[PDB]
Amino acid sequence: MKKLQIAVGIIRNENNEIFITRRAADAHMANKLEFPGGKIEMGETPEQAVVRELQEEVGITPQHFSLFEKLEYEFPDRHITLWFWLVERWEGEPWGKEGQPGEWMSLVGLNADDFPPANEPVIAKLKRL
Ligand SMILES: Nc1nc2c([nH]c(=O)n2[C@H]2C[C@H](O)[C@@H](COP(=O)(O)OP(=O)(O)OP(=O)(O)O)O2)c(=O)[nH]1
Ligand code: NA
Ligand code: NA
Prior knowledge:
Protein name: 8-oxo-dGTP diphosphatase
Distance between the termini: 35 Å
Bound molecules: 8-OXO-2'-deoxyguanosine-5'-triphosphate, sodium ion
PDB class: hydrolase
Enzyme class: hydrolase
Family: Belongs to the Nudix hydrolase family.
InterPro entries: Mutator_MutT, MutT-like, Nudix_hydrolase, NUDIX_hydrolase-like_dom_sf, NUDIX_hydrolase_CS, NUDIX_hydrolase_dom
């Protein structure tokens, strides 16, 4: 099975809300809630990837973020490594720049069942911040 490196951004505002998008019906992990992000490309670092992905997907430039969690997940047909970046400062206002659903969700109200299963320990970790 193919093995991908994925960089995602946990976009947290000052009211402890997270900017969460929903994946398309024909995507892998279809219809799931997600942190915006995507594939790290050849020639780019994980730090560069999360910046580029958040610019493409939601129209913000992260600054002074940090690695919140790195983990491996074996899906039924693919293995990925997920780089979860905590993004607490950024330029711009996040929106559905690719036409995807996107909105602010209270951290305490997040339900891990709504996300890909790889996100479960990260969501649990965020809720103890
Ligand atoms: N973006 C994102 N992906 C996640 C999360 N949790 C999780 O297991 N994934 C998985 C789903 C996918 O298998 C993979 C992300 O791939 P993607 O479809 O977002 O990649 P991409 O946008 O770069 O794809 P492409 O259209 O550029 O080719 O990581 C998450 O919180 N955010
Ligand atoms: Na991508
Ligand atoms: Na993506």
